[PDB]
Amino acid sequence: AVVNTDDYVTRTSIFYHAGSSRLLTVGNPYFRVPAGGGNKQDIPKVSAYQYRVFRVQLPDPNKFGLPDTSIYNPETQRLVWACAGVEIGRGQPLGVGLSGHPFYNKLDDTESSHAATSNVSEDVRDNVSVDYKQTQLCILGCAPAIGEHWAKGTASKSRPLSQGDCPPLELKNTVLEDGDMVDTGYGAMDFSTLQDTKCEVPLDICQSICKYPDYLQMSADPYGDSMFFCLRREQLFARHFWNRAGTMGDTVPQSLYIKGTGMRASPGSCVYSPSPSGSIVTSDSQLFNKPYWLHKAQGHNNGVCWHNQLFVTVVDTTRSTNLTICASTQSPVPGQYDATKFKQYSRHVEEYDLQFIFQLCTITLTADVMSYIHSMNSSILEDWNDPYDKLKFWNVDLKEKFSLDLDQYPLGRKFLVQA
Amino acid sequence: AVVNTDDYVTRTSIFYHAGSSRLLTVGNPYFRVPAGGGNKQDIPKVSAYQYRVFRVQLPDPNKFGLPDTSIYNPETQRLVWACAGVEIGRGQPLGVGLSGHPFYNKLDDTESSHAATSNVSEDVRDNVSVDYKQTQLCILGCAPAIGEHWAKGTASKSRPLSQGDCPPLELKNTVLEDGDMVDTGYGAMDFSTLQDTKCEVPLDICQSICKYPDYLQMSADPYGDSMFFCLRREQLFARHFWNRAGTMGDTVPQSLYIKGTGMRASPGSCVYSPSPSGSIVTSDSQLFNKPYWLHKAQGHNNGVCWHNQLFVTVVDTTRSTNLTICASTQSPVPGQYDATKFKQYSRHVEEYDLQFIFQLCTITLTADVMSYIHSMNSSILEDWNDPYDKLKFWNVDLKEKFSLDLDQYPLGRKFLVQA
Amino acid sequence: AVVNTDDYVTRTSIFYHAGSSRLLTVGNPYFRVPAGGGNKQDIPKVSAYQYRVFRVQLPDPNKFGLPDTSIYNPETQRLVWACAGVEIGRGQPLGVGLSGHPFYNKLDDTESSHAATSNVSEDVRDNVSVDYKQTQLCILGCAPAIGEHWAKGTASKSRPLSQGDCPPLELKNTVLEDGDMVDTGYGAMDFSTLQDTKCEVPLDICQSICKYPDYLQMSADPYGDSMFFCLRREQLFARHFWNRAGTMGDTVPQSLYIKGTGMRASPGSCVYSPSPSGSIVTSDSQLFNKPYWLHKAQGHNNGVCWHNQLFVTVVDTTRSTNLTICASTQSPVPGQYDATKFKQYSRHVEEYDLQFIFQLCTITLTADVMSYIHSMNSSILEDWNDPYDKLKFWNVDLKEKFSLDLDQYPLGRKFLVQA
């Protein structure tokens, strides 16, 4: 049986403030720009509709200095950090941003007649941009959050899948990486493999894997390691109703319609896609730039950061403004306007500021407690005396940024106010 | 007189947690796809605008092992489960989705445009998609929920109904079963019989019976078995105003207009349909993924699950994203784009986590209590020593999934912290 | 080590009211109009989307007339004003206002189908107006607020930036001064240097620097001088989706779409701009015309106004109505309408009522306290015996508007009711 961590983790009154200075990323919100086109190094894909998974590295409390040497006995005790409070400060202004495809696979405007539709062209893909669903989510664990998506199933050897058929859909639970893309109103699925035309969804989610956090597995985790703190805020609606150009693999049954004559002899495209939109970006609907405390967690892990590390998965699509940058191709700006002689760039910026209030915690390593933690994860006992090594995170190192002076910092001031 | 169930049902202090791990269904959101065409098995009509009626099977408490045998006397008592708490974790991403008809019987836009003011005889059906009313309903009973809809009346032998006349609408109170269609903004009505055109409503409700729960009828139930817990939230508006093509069976009276000349000599189509639309899908207005306790019920039955079974009728249209999957006809995807070489499919995915906290309850089977239960339902005494045979439910089996270790499960943790 | 101000600042019971009677500015909301067109002096650029930083000048309390001369010791104690209450009265009616460009660099509407979907050449720029994001922020400090924006980076001499390439974006923290333009939904960016088109954004932000207050920077300020009171309320959405005309330096990768035919043989313009819009200007969402008290502050200064000065950075875009003034070019207004005989002027008006309740405070100048004050700011000891010289602040002089009789003024009555 998994016990609550308060039985074998003793909370003491020693609190610390750990804060990253300033986290800034600038990059193209749709694709990674490789070096060679006139810029040094690769411009990353920095988007607001993208998972920001910070791997917060904490110092080992068993080796660095403490206010009291006699607060614990090193022979029979080992220390661990517990996140007592969090502050995900966002610097950039609230804004809306657009992602779109130059060839968006939409056939007709199924909402109503638009008087701009032309049925003379075979390829009806046009430059279409949408906003996405307004998503804010903040997950703190000592393990990274688990995200679900829909992908192609395995290929059966006995009955092969014929080309053109709908592949079987499986729900894959992966680790939410830094740079994974959040749900956008088009669903959490593998658009690289499920969608072959590369034209049905906008440019950032075109060849990416959109992932939604599987809160059922993180809540149903026995130890509560992957998620002991969570906030959600989602908002979307359908602006424009669109068809999908292509052959209908799932033919409509004859019992569902009455045949006409000519183009109405056979039914048209019946795969319908809505245009997602986070409706209004308001400052009153913000779960960021606000202090959040961890008196009680959802799981058995009550904020205790095992292996001296924390994982903060943050999605903030409320600050999604992609800056538009123009560069004149001529060294003087021309007197008369020529659209050919101006280069247009889209650059999205993410500004993050991570404050945490951590609590020192003594663990009495008795035989039963040691056996329980060994059955939990033996690497804790190996370190006291790295599974997530290939996987990519935004690493923030607060090893030298722990401080006993809480009042020097805003989250520490708020913590001292509430205490 | 029907008494409240708390008079003869004694609630013990022991509780159980019972929860299905994950209920996943992938299927076409508009119709069932027959076998063949690359599918070795059928593709069900899995839709968000559809009744998910789970038949939860509980073990017979008079038979399996208990932590203390001496809590009841088998000679003079019997046991029954009472639902003390529920959590319907609906784990998909929040999203919007469209249902549409390739031949939607809309004449023209009567909202703004100077469209037409005449009878039209040619085929003007257009490929039109709509969203629906954003509704969530959660009903727990020990009997399946009742649903009201409007259908054709019986054929009177004295006065037969002539062909083309409007048949008399009558209110049928059927059973809300799995696969039944929820109200979609077009009304709770049998569209298969009352609409012979098969073109006025989208494909998922074109030949289906849309049913709405008659909350008046199952709250006026003497025993309250069909519904002891209910949550409602409906939200819709009208996007587009549409005239319906065809002959007007009920002619507009001459005292309601003034005749014009020529084209406006006679009134046009006057059957008007709105385009339903759930306004904004927002996460704070969700009544799922939340724990709900059953201290008091609306009726006499206070959550007591007779015949060791439960019925959970769930509609959540707030996660209605139809994933669009396209597959290229050629084995390599060509560099040039051809619209007819990509087969298109729509797949809706439904993901559930049904967690319950049940309370063991003993029944002091005296003469009056036994007579009252026998008058209430004679099958309870026969079981203590199946009317829903043809009805289609999502049968979930929780026979071997009952646990006394409440703190190891999320709903058990929330129940222990709330008590 | 910075300490909270309450340890060395003694709060007295003497309160004062300070209020500018009426602060009115009328000016062209898009640009500054120089003199020479038949009028005296220059019409300033007065816009609602513009930072109003009031430099409030307070009398020096060491020489100010006080009700009790013997309430302190001149030899061992010095005096300072502490802001106890504030009210930013806004006089103009609530309203929406528009700013636009006669040549707005948009290619086509990517919201839906737009027809003539590919403009191959020629000038496409259109006379386009937008509203902006609804922003209300009010910041009081004893130092001016710190605002962030994105500007061009410093070009390296070893690797100069080639013409036409995207310059590196650098986050500059400047001082929020009067006349600075707030972020308007297009991004807190330097539009003078980062957009060579001078056609990308409306005229009021076309050649201006849009700044957003770096709340993280002045919240993490040790002394908390720049911000001890702050209110924010931002609200926006995307009305129209527009595509930026011009050459693309960041070419869309070939693996990220499928090549079309003819006009679709190249990907079109893929830099997308939303149209910002404050959704609804509603009276209960106003954070102005309301009294706010300063019992506790986020920083270490609890409203203490060092150097006998205050800085109130206020933007209120909820009253953004740009009045339209038509003047006929004929001395009699003609009875026959000619479009070219009326001159149109846009004039925006700002009405402000700065109101404060200040508290007298004594500083016991003990040697360690004096050392702490000298370490915080050496100019305080010089004054007790400026860096903001070139900065443009709206200077208001409340040296001769301090009154002990609070009940004669509205904020004094509300303070007496509150206290």
């Epitope: 008087a115 032309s118 062209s121 183009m263 | 100077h114 059906r125 | 590919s118």
Partner: antibody
């Protein structure tokens, strides 16, 4: 069946205005696009422009300065005006029903007028 | 390509197959639907092929349409004496943004 008829002056003197009208019988005008297409003798067809159902116009750019197309819903007609005609504007003019603007539009001109021969001479 | 390249005339044995070609460019024929029309002097043109292969109601099934690359072809199987008439192709030029038409193909039934 939808039928199109052209009416107008057969002979138009040069530098005057060429006026033609097309009447639709057996169909409605507020549904599809309506185009004017001219064939000079000795050569092929030449597109002029079309009028929408709502009243929006599109034109051939090479004739865009000289072509005005109007629509009359009450008269169920649509008219072509061609100012400053030259000798090259002598042509057989056909009004046609460009099926466009909806989901099941075939594209192109499903129904054609017979056309009227307009000769420009002094 | 303002004028689609068509043969000035075509001939064929009755009962045989006659193919009329129509050459355009990547902006008019390859990227848009081509429509094949039947026109006789003195009568209104009649649509035969729409969306490069489909036929309307009343058009005989012997007429067929194909489109390969930037070229299109109209095939008449079982040539009859009533087919001695002009045929042409029409499509939409995106580069010129107009309706381009073929020069016409007077078919003689020999």
């Amino acid at each position: 069946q939808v039928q199109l008829q052209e009416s107008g002056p057969g002979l138009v003197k040069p530098s005057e205005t060429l006026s033609l009208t097309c009447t639709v019988s057996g169909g409605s005008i507020t549904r599809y696009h309506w185009s004017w297409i001219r064939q000079p003798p000795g050569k092929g067809l030449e597109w002029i422009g079309n009028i929408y159902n709502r009243g929006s116009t599109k034109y051939n750019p090479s004739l865009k300065s000289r072509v005005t197309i109007s629509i009359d819903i009450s008269n169920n007609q649509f008219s072509l005006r061609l100012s400053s005609v030259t000798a090259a504007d002598t042509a057989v003019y056909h009004c046609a029903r460009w099926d466009n603007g909806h989901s099941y539009a075939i594209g192109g001109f499903d129904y054609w007028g017979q056309g009227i021969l307009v000769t420009v001479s002094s | 390509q303002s004028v689609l390249t068509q043969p000035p005339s075509a001939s064929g044995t009755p009962g045989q197959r006659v193919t009329i070609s129509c050459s355009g460019s990547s902006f008019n024929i390859e990227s848009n639907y081509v429509y094949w029309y039947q026109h006789l002097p003195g009568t209104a043109p009649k649509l035969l092929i729409y969306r490069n292969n489909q036929r309307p109601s009343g058009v005989p099934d012997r007429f067929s349409g194909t489109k390969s690359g930037t070229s299109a072809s109209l095939a008449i199987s079982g040539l009859r004496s009533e087919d001695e008439t002009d045929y042409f192709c029409a499509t939409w030029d995106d580069s010129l943004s107009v309706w381009v038409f073929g020069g016409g193909t007077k078919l003689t039934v020999l």
